[PDB]
């Protein structure tokens, strides 16, 4: 059934991916012996947030439709002291396909939106873990043409943690 093209938890040296801001927005965060890589951003404090973090190269495979799976946690605007009108709890999932396995830099207007994505759950100041509240959210973008493409994540002012990506094809 399913292809794997990209498994982000699986990846063995750098991932490679880029971020802009390069600093103070999405940041790679670990947290590993019996209790692992995470990107994070956590700026709900700050106003006009507008922190992406994009993948390399995901080669398509041929397939007309891939899938993206996304695993994350984030947490509940109510339980960030000093949140003002600028907390978020949804963060934007785009896509940008390329033939450029190589591309030098990509503006944030070349990529298209697949979705605005909402947590199932969220963590709060009671919990002291807690992966019951890890969310798994699957999209899917449609007819491709190019050889491969990049997946971008765009915070607009969420707390949150990027677990694992996975992008395959069925």
């Given amino acids: 059934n399913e292809v794997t093209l990209l498994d982000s938890r699986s990846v063995q040296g750098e991932l490679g991916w880029i971020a802009?801001?390069?600093?103070?927005?999405?940041?790679?965060?670990?947290?590993?012996e019996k209790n692992i890589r995470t990107y994070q951003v956590c700026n709900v404090m700050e106003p006009s947030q507008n922190n992406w973090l994009r993948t390399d190269w995901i080669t398509r495979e041929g397939a007309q439709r891939v899938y993206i799976e996304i695993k994350f946690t984030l947490r509940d605007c109510n339980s960030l002291p000093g949140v003002m009108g600028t907390c978020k709890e949804t963060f934007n999932l785009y896509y940008y396909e390329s033939d450029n396995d190589k591309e030098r830099f990509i503006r944030e207007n070349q990529f298209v939106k697949i979705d605005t994505i909402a947590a199932d759950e969220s963590f709060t100041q009671v919990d002291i873990g807690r992966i019951m509240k890890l969310n798994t959210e699957i999209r899917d973008v449609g007819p491709l043409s190019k050889k491969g493409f990049y997946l971008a994540f765009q915070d607009v002012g969420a707390c949150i943690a990027l677990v694992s990506v996975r992008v395959f094809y069925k």
């Fill in 20 to 32: 802009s801001p390069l600093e103070g927005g999405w940041e790679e965060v670990s947290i590993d």
